Amino acid sequence: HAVCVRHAFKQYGSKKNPNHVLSDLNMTVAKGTIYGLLGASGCGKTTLLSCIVGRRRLNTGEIWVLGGKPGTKGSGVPGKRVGYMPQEIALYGEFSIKETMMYFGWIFGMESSEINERLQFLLNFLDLPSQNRLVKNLSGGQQRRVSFAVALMHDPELLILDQPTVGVDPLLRQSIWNHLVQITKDGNKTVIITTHYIEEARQAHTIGLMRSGKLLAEESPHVLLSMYGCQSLEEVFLKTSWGKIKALLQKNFLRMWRNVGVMLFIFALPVMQVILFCLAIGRDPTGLKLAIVNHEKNYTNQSYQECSFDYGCKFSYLSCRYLNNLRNSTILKEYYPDPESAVDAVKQGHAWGALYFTENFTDALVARMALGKDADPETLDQSEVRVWLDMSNQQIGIILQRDLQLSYQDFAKDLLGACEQNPDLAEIPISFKEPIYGSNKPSFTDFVAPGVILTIVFFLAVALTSSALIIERMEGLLDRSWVAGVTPGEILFSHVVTQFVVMCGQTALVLIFMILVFGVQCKGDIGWVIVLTILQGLCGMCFGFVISAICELERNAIQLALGSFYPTLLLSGVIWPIEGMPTVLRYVSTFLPLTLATTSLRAMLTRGWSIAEPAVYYGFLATIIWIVAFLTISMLVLRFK
Amino acid sequence: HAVCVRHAFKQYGSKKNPNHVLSDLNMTVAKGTIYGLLGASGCGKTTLLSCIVGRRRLNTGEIWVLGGKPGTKGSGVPGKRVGYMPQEIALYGEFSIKETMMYFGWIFGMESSEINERLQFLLNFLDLPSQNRLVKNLSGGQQRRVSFAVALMHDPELLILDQPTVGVDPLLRQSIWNHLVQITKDGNKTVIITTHYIEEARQAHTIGLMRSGKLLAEESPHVLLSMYGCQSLEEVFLKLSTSWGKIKALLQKNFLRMWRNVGVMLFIFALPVMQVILFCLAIGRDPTGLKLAIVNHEKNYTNQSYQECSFDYGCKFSYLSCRYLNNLRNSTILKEYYPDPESAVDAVKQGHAWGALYFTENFTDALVARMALGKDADPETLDQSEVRVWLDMSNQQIGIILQRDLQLSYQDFAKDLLGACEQNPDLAEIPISFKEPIYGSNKPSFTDFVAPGVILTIVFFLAVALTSSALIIERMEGLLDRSWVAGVTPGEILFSHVVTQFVVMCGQTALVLIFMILVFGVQCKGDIGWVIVLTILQGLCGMCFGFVISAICELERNAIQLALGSFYPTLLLSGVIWPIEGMPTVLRYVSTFLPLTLATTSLRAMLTRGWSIAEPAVYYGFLATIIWIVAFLTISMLVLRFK
């Protein structure tokens, strides 16, 4: 015998209503015969064939094919001794008709010499087009012929065909059946074929009709047809492992290269957004305008005042002397005649402030500087600059305030120096010494970059892994490759290697553009930064594993990834210090995947701390624990599935 | 006559790559007959049927159905009087059988009991389960009998069936053929059925063999059998050489398809609410638990949490180093005490503090003599009268807080020293006097700056996702083309989708505005009337961008890449999380032409300043959003015409 199904049982659904399909079978197939499995719906027999090959299991009963159990020991149905054609077209669209045969030839372990001979034979037999045409460019009928060629190409000894003749010209279906009869008659082979044209399967040596959940009858066509003296069959029915890893790796690196959309999305988007972020976010505002109502000098234009004075003693004007100390980068002076037009300009939106030096500014400032603590109230109001600022914008309102006081500090120090005096006399008692861990003029982009790097690397892996594992299982490609002999260990190993290479390339590009091209500093060790980025990428890949394990449609996976991409970015302190959140939220947010990693990377970049500091290796510990947790969850989900 | 095709020519692809499907075809179907159309591929027959019903055109030919050109002036093909069942299953999975039949009964214009009678007949005839069973729960073979009942329910004069008897038992095959023959017999009922089981097609009154884009034999089957001498139908094949009633039905279906999908409700209604809550709790607030290492050598040292800082509030300036620390802000600075200046700095070099203070052992003697000597202070008293602060300035937003809190606390210290001895506190003020701000307050919030940019981005990009996905999904499964044959114009399809989306972001705008303004106290100094109008106008601009993506994309997974490929660059160029003044001179000029750059600036002016529509900075965001609505419609209309 070849297959000895006995007392088979199966049921879909749940306890509320189990879909009772394929119950209490009795099927047997002998060597050298063309079996025929006929039915009504194209899924009561697909389940049986899937159970026979080994990609599914029966609830009760015994199953026996080609020596032993379908897929553990003795039998060879998960091996190269069975040819399988899935009901759908389980083929890759980026391959030629020659590469799509060389791939399976390497998977089945055949020498490359015989593949060409069998390729020419199958091309002659099936009159397929030129062997260099891509599969995705073929029509819907030649794909089935290519799949038939792939099924026959390795010379199996038990052919299991799932509707091979549906959209085929009858002048070719006749040849197909003749070929099956030829190879089965004398060879030590067997054929199991399911068809929808009951009358077509007249050359089968045995026909088993499937009705409800069991084989209705089992007999040769002649005896079955002559039992009732029928005229038609429809009337009766109306009563080494390294060789299989290289091929997977090559196909994985080729499928990503012939799809320009994927290459763009996962290689030119990170670079573009890194460039945009470095060019736009974090820089100091420039070009801010001011309204100057300096009444100590005559008014000529709105862009000219003739601010001239003396750089020595005698303190000529001291209102042009102060304005000379204002920074020329972030402030552009504009001149107005009276203190009402200036505030009107601020109100309408033509400026950010007003100054209004009083016409008695010098004669009162040089009196305040000399009188000291015994100064009358008159020479304390006519010796001041009155600033009406626009505080609707926080960042712009901070820079203006800071630069209107640093300029006065420089003004006072210059006054003291030009008078041959100690310049420390113009200093507040609070004395800010050299910063311990930074510079006196910090930047905001150096705070956001370690946390944009990790965000990019983490969230560009979940999508790729989820899509690659969803659009491949749902198309019947993983199941087709499994029957060829590829164990699940090799598929996972190849996928991990491919994803590792992709994330290594992404990390290289992002770190080259952030640190070398632009001015983002790195005071720590670059090797540990690379290791942390790669570990975050692996954590993202494990999250993609979980997402693809619990999801079955490619549109639900994107929703699930997007629903978790926002809160983690908003809670991990990427764009604002984590010290601002409330106490309860600050404790919850440290258990998220990206919080401690971002903190440790920021410490590495902006302080230079080694690996021994707890604030540095807590990120590594958190990332490793999250990888382990994601792997455990992914394995647990696939238990009841 | 019912259908007349002459000299039909049709091909796909470009000029370089020819894909001739039909070329010099001749067809003729009488009235009261079953045609039957047998082929090989499975796509030429579908193309011929699509050309007959009107959903596809002919490159060169002449088609005459039911009176005239199919869908131009006098042929009743694009509406009722025809029954079309597509090759696929164009059915809605959220509806039961009864709702599915009632929707198509209302589309055609039948009554509420003339649908129930047909339901009662067809359920018994086709052997279907109870009418209260959802379609998605039905098996793959029971979703085809439902389509057959939908096609046969309204009793048209021309049934066009595409592979009816597939995935069905032979008994039901014979029953269906018997019913077709019965309805056709002695009447004006015409059937055109493209079956694949060749031998079953002998019951027809004509046979339509197709090969190489033409028709070899177009004749009766009893003549086909006894003209070639063959006794078969397969072996002879082997011889080589009122618009308000239709908008209402579409609007009601649209809401029940979003209400019955719980995952869709959470993504478009419960996700914006969660984003708003987490933004107001995390982003913008000032740091609070900052720690400082304090070395006060004017007092005995006991603990790392206790120093016994005491002084006299009145006068005589007892200690003045505990007096200054008394003025430090208790909310955002925590005080920890260390015994040596060198031991406190080592605390900063680890993760234990943000600064050190180190008041000298003779701070009071030097400081009092410093302010009582004026400009005659010797260098020695300028050294022991100062506070030495070593800050950790790696963080920009914390170094600013610490620097400002340590100098503000000295203004209060000085203004209380003089003032407690009968002096004017104005003597302790720098000449630069900041009067009352014209706009805002002395303590602006960063979360008030980023707030306008979060409302606009949430609404804009949640309409791109909803419009693109709904239009791509319904078009690819034949649902949109099946409704067009029933008599629903493209005007009624677009009208019902615009209205369905309008109520979607009307609900979204209410929740985003309520939580941000009413609950979390984000100020709104302007008019709330114009904030709602501008926020809604951004939703329609986003929706019109959904039309563009769905017009040029066929697979859903490609739309996400296009939507996400433009969602990231805009947020970094529209000035949402940073002032637009930080950009370079050239990138700033380009950025203002993006959809959200000028609308965010306008909304920020109405919230944080109170400007009205009459200000140029406010209506420039209304005009820049009306222009992008027109541009997005022009781009999408050009693509459909050219493809």
Ligand SMILES: CCCCCCCCCCC(CCCCCCCCCC)(CO[C@@H]1O[C@H](CO)[C@@H](O[C@H]2O[C@H](CO)[C@@H](O)[C@H](O)[C@H]2O)[C@H](O)[C@H]1O)CO[C@@H]1O[C@H](CO)[C@@H](O[C@H]2O[C@H](CO)[C@@H](O)[C@H](O)[C@H]2O)[C@H](O)[C@H]1O
């Ligand atoms: C870790 C390593 C994993 C392995 C490598 C990973 C890639 C492997 C999967 C590749 C993949 C997923 C990509 C999703 C990942 C990123 C999503 C992230 C989502 C972000 C939220 C990319 O899919 C490709 O994307 C192309 C973009 O270039 C796109 O082409 C479009 O834009 C082009 C641009 O101009 C434009 O030219 C082109 O005309 C457009 O069509 C097509 O959809 C497709 O070719 C899917 O592969 C696709 O599978 C298709 C069958 O479904 C297969 O179909 C073909 O053949 C069928 C015959 O069986 C036949 O029946 C189909 O009709 C036929 O079409 C495609 O050939 C194959 O490629």
Ligand SMILES: CCCCCCCCCCC(CCCCCCCCCC)(CO[C@@H]1O[C@H](CO)[C@@H](O[C@H]2O[C@H](CO)[C@@H](O)[C@H](O)[C@H]2O)[C@H](O)[C@H]1O)CO[C@@H]1O[C@H](CO)[C@@H](O[C@H]2O[C@H](CO)[C@@H](O)[C@H](O)[C@H]2O)[C@H](O)[C@H]1O
């Ligand atoms: C202003 C415009 C007005 C338009 C209003 C109408 C819009 C409604 C569109 C509905 C839609 C688009 C979703 C768009 C996402 C929007 C965000 C964009 C993406 C983010 C960038 C929702 O899509 C559905 O979302 C469901 C979420 O609940 C999901 O359910 C999943 O998660 C659940 C939760 O955990 C979980 O409980 C549940 O178990 C899961 O199954 C469904 O599987 C998924 O298909 C697609 O509709 C779906 O279409 C399916 C066939 O295509 C159709 O399948 C049925 O039909 C066929 C036989 O009849 C046949 O195919 C199927 O055999 C049959 O089943 C579904 O019935 C129908 O629903």
Ligand SMILES: CC/C=C\C/C=C/C/C=C\C/C=C/C/C=C/CCCCOC[C@H](COP(=O)(O)OCCN)OC(=O)CCCCCCCCCCCCCCCCC
């Ligand atoms: C927020 C608004 C901002 C700007 C608004 C607008 C500007 C213009 C207004 C309209 C113009 C354009 C909209 C976009 C269109 C463009 C038209 C053509 C695309 C037609 O797309 C066909 C198929 C899908 O085709 P398919 O599904 O197979 O259907 C068969 C049809 N042939 O796309 C795909 O696969 C692509 C999948 C994602 C591809 C990239 C994703 C992310 C990009 C990142 C790269 C950025 C770096 C730049 C690269 C240069 C450096 C080397």
Ligand SMILES: CC/C=C\C/C=C\C/C=C/C/C=C/C/C=C\CCCCOC[C@H](COP(=O)(O)OCCN)OC(=O)CCCCCCCCCCCCCCCCC
């Ligand atoms: C950086 C982030 C990293 C980590 C974050 C944190 C912790 C990780 C622990 C992670 C473990 C799991 C999460 C998955 C959970 C659970 C399973 C569920 C779906 C399983 O799936 C079913 C199908 C798909 O099922 P289907 O495709 O039909 O296949 C048939 C199978 N039945 O999903 C769908 O429709 C869902 C489509 C999008 C639904 C929501 C999208 C956005 C959420 C926003 C709402 C937030 C507010 C909450 C609402 C409460 C207040 C009213």
Ligand SMILES: CCCCCCCC/C=C\CCCCCCCC(=O)N[C@@H](CO)[C@H](O)CCCCCCCCCCCCCCC
């Ligand atoms: C239109 C397509 C989106 C469809 C759904 C849209 C629905 C509403 C959108 C946002 C809701 C508003 C909630 C936050 C959005 C705006 C408000 C804000 O505060 N935005 C900031 C933080 O979110 C801003 O984004 C900071 C970016 C800096 C880091 C950049 C790294 C980017 C990773 C690139 C690769 C990861 C790929 C992951 C999956 C590939």
